[PDB]
Write an enzyme that holds these catalytic residues in place. Structure first.
Site, PDB file in Angstrom:
ATOM      1  N   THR A  23       0.804  -1.081   0.057  1.00 59.47           N
ATOM      2  CA  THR A  23       0.059  -0.071   0.079  1.00 59.47           C
ATOM      3  C   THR A  23       0.766   1.404  -0.070  1.00 59.47           C
ATOM      4  O   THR A  23       1.921   1.119   0.272  1.00 59.47           O
ATOM      5  CB  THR A  23      -0.774  -0.168   1.253  1.00 59.47           C
ATOM      6  N   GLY A  37      -3.158   4.912  -2.562  1.00 59.76           N
ATOM      7  CA  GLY A  37      -3.760   3.598  -2.931  1.00 59.76           C
ATOM      8  C   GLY A  37      -2.865   2.326  -2.766  1.00 59.76           C
ATOM      9  O   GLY A  37      -2.385   2.106  -1.556  1.00 59.76           O
ATOM     10  N   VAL A  45      -0.257  -1.229  -4.571  1.00 63.60           N
ATOM     11  CA  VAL A  45       0.068  -1.928  -5.800  1.00 63.60           C
ATOM     12  C   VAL A  45      -0.793  -3.303  -5.522  1.00 63.60           C
ATOM     13  O   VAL A  45      -0.530  -4.061  -4.631  1.00 63.60           O
ATOM     14  CB  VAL A  45       1.475  -2.090  -5.773  1.00 63.60           C
ATOM     15  N   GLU A  70       5.787  -4.522 -14.788  1.00 61.26           N
ATOM     16  CA  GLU A  70       6.294  -6.052 -14.607  1.00 61.26           C
ATOM     17  C   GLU A  70       6.011  -6.561 -13.189  1.00 61.26           C
ATOM     18  O   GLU A  70       6.670  -5.541 -12.515  1.00 61.26           O
ATOM     19  CB  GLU A  70       7.777  -6.055 -15.366  1.00 61.26           C
ATOM     20  N   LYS A 117      14.898   3.452  -0.649  1.00 62.39           N
ATOM     21  CA  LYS A 117      14.786   2.707   0.567  1.00 62.39           C
ATOM     22  C   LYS A 117      14.633   1.120   0.349  1.00 62.39           C
ATOM     23  O   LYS A 117      14.111   0.745  -0.507  1.00 62.39           O
ATOM     24  CB  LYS A 117      13.807   3.363   1.621  1.00 62.39           C
ATOM     25  N   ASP A 170       8.453   2.537  -7.763  1.00 62.01           N
ATOM     26  CA  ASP A 170       8.020   3.465  -7.452  1.00 62.01           C
ATOM     27  C   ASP A 170       8.821   4.649  -7.690  1.00 62.01           C
ATOM     28  O   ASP A 170       9.770   5.192  -6.929  1.00 62.01           O
ATOM     29  CB  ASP A 170       7.786   3.438  -5.912  1.00 62.01           C
ATOM     30  N   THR A 221      11.520  10.114   2.295  1.00 62.04           N
ATOM     31  CA  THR A 221      11.015   9.371   3.406  1.00 62.04           C
ATOM     32  C   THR A 221      12.010   9.988   4.483  1.00 62.04           C
ATOM     33  O   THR A 221      13.188   9.549   4.471  1.00 62.04           O
ATOM     34  CB  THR A 221      11.142   7.946   3.133  1.00 62.04           C
TER      35      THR A 221
END
Lengths: 15, 353
Positions: free
Chosen positions: B54, B58, B60, B124, B171, B187, B204
């Site tokens: 998550t 939303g 994945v 993918e 990360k 991401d 992050t």
């Protein structure tokens, strides 16, 4: 003694 | 000197060949960046199978393409959450950059589309799971295993930065392990094409460079800082600036004081002090010698950079594989509905998506 976040870390979009 | 004649000539030639590769890579990228290709699809072309992760906006999801039978990872973004968190341009960045890049350690985008409620990016499926899971399970990686992963990130950033792309969210959560044990960066939510400085406060907390936290216009060197955090965390099992709350994390980052586990090699500590360097005039990856300061560092002396690129190095770890749609290497998440409103939401804000 050390302590911190061990779970998945969410991104921030502002500070 | 450190290198004899033969070694020096070999290294020099290798570095020139990198320049030649990158020049061609840039030509290819710009052609796709300027005139992107159609990659449309629609939701009912897929069967939804399982939530793989998550995020903001939303999830994945593992999906199965109905016609081809192929499995994919589908990132779903609810448009109304995106517009409120002023993540509109970031989401446009993400799609456009994923569409245009090509590198063995960058996940490959297959489709993108939108409906009344959501944005969709179909890429993918990388079945080996997140580095994060594997790292938390084992505790820490050996220095050779950390180095194998680190080398892939160094090459990936060398590629991205040559295209004027900053990644901005390195990360373990964002690094998937493929069937051959190599990394796939996913991401691209904060990736951006930046010629010099940019100013958005994002990333992050544990991985933020001090200059981001201090609201300074910053550059691609924030990714090299983040590499230092990643290498430290892979080799220690926890990151260098470690605290329960973001504000405490920021305080530690800005102080800059790093302490190392007693098992860290001297080579590793030297590399990390040069990456986790608050002074931008001294940070590796930000000096005259560019990425070569990192690639030629003693901690990477055993790394064959071309062999890593060619994926000919034996991986430390080969994930359990149980079939093309197996999800055993991923944690479980609450399964929520994929709502698609009768009425179009935020049509103005996402016209170019």
């Amino acid at each position: 003694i050390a302590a911190g976040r061990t779970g998945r870390r969410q991104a921030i979009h502002d500070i | 000197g450190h290198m004899g004649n033969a070694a020096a000539a070999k290294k020099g030639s290798e570095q020139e060949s990198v320049k030649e590769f990158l020049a061609k890579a840039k030509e290819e990228f710009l052609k796709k960046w300027e005139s992107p290709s159609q990659n449309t699809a629609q939701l009912d072309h897929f069967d939804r199978i399982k939530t793989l992760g998550t995020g903001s906006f939303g999830r994945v999801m593992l999906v199965k393409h109905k016609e081809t039978g192929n499995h994919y990872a589908m990132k779903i973004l609810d448009k109304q959450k995106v517009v409120k968190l002023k993540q509109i341009e970031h989401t446009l960045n993400e799609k456009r950059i994923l569409q245009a890049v090509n590198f063995p350690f960058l996940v490959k985008l297959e489709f993108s589309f939108k409906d009344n409620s959501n944005l969709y990016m179909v890429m993918e499926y990388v079945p080996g799971g997140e580095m994060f899971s594997h790292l938390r399970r084992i505790g820490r990686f050996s220095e050779p295993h950390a180095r194998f992963y680190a080398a892939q990130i160094v090459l990936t950033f060398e590629y991205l930065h040559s295209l004027d792309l900053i990644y901005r969210d390195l990360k373990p959560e964002n690094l998937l392990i493929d069937q051959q044990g190599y990394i796939q960066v996913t991401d691209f939510g904060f990736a951006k094409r930046v010629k010099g400085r940019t100013w958005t406060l994002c990333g992050t907390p544990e991985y933020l460079a001090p200059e981001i936290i201090l609201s300074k216009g910053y550059n691609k060197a924030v990714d090299w800082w983040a590499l230092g955090v990643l290498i430290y965390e892979m080799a220690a099992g926890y990151p260098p600036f470690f605290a329960d709350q973001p504000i405490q994390i920021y305080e530690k980052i800005v102080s800059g004081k790093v302490r190392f586990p007693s098992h860290f090699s001297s080579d590793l500590k030297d590399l990390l002090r040069n990456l986790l360097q608050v002074d931008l005039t001294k940070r590796f990856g930000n000096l005259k010698n560019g990425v070569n300061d990192i690639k030629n560092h003693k901690w990477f002396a055993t790394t064959d950079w071309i062999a890593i690129y060619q994926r000919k190095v034996e991986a430390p770890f080969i994930p359990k594989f149980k079939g093309p749609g197996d999800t055993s290497n991923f944690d479980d998440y609450e399964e929520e509905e994929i709502r698609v409103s009768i009425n179009e939401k935020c049509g103005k804000e996402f016209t170019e998506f």
